[PDB]
Paper text:
As the most abundant viral protein encoded by the M gene segment, matrix protein 1 (M1) forms a shell underneath a host cell-derived lipid biolayer to connect the vRNPs with the viral envelope in mature virions. The full-length M1 protein includes 252 amino acids consisting of a highly organized N-terminal domain and a flexible but less ordered C-terminal domain that are linked by a protease-sensitive loop. So far, only the N-terminal domain of M1 has been structurally resolved at an atomic level, showing that at neutral pH the physiological monomers have a high tendency to oligomerize via a so-called ‘face-to-back’ arrangement, whereas at acidic pH the N-terminal domain exists as a dimeric structure in a so-called ‘face-to-face’ arrangement.
M(NLS-88R)-acidic has monomers A and B or C and D associated to form two independent physiological dimers (dimers 1 and 2, respectively) in the crystal. Least-squares superpositions of the four M(NLS-88R)-acidic monomers or superposition of its two independent dimers resulted in low r.m.s.d.s of 0.2–0.4 Å or 0.4 Å, suggesting similar quaternary conformation or monomer–monomer arrangements. Interactions between the monomers that form the face-to-face dimer in M(NLS-88R)-acidic, M(NLS-88E)-acidic or M(NLS-88E)-neutral involve hydrophobic contacts (mainly between the symmetry-related helices H6, and between helices H9 and loops L9), as well as several hydrogen-bond and/or salt-bridge interactions. When compared to the M(NLS-88E)-neutral dimer interface, the positively charged Lys104 side-chain in M(NLS-88R)-acidic has reoriented to avoid close contact with the positively charged opposing Arg88. In addition to these conserved inter-subunit hydrogen-bonds, the G88R mutation also results in an extra hydrogen-bond from Arg88-NE to Arg134-O in M(NLS-88)-acidic structure. This additional inter-subunit interaction may explain why it took longer for M(NLS-88R) M1 to disintegrate in vitro at pH 5.5 than wt-M1, as the fulcrum of M(NLS-88R)-acidic was relatively difficult to break during the dimer interface rotation. Of note, the face-to-face dimeric interaction is stronger than the face-to-back monomeric interaction as indicated by the BLI data. Thus, the acid-facilitated M1 conformational change is likely irreversible, presumably to prevent dissociated M1 from re-associating with vRNP in the cytosol after virus uncoating.
Residue numbers in the entry:
A (entry chain B), B (entry chain A): 2 to 158
Amino acid sequence: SLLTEVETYVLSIVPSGPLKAEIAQRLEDVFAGKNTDLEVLMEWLKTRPILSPLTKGILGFVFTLTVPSERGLQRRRFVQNALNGNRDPNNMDKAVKLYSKLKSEITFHGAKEIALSYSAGALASCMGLIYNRMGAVTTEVAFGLVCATCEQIADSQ
Amino acid sequence: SLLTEVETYVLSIVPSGPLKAEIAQRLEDVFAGKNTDLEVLMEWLKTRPILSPLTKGILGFVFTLTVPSERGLQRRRFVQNALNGNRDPNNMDKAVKLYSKLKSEITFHGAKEIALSYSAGALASCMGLIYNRMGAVTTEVAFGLVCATCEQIADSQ
């Protein structure tokens, strides 16, 4: 299941312990269409301890895509910094290169496979590019990108 | 003064009429620091008739850059959508290339010079990288980048 897969890849990069079962629960409620309202979750996430800025950025990216509507909720600075690729032009170049390819994909698996050739930083930057409205993709591709990003991050630990 | 320079360049891409006189006054007010709030200014811009999304975006970039502080105001969706080079991979590729060079640039004239070598689309995309926190440049250089963008847009007109 698309969302089942997303949850597994996302949690893989989340520290073990209490907070993790919290993210699992919130992720599942949002996926089930339950716990509505994007800015409440985002603010909760922004202020959570233990989580690294990147994993918050990755989660922030997920909630933003999965909630029915974000309304006029502006994109969060905290997420924007986390997915900034460290302002490294090299990551950016790769990000755009990767974006150019994902642009024609519409399936989760097709998107996941092409993005796995890139570094975790290149992928986070691509995510950033999409989160910042400068790049656009389908929900399934965005999710593939997230999973590849998580896989890459996880396999480096 | 670099600022009055930015004003003229920015004003060059605004159509004539009473609205242009107001933009001029608000810019001059910001420069003199007539204690103007960013949220207030951005909402004003956002809702102006006549001005196109691009002009609105360019002006929004100048205001956030010259206000004393954003006061924690999240970046605006209307600007992000205006400065995304139309989400085109090529303008984006060129933008990253220009950013890569502006990064090491330190003067207004130098940034402007190199900037004028790129297309208007790659310049708006570049302004987007800055506005989205994906890249970072010294103010004077950013000032160079906007004037270049305006010069290229004014020329094609």
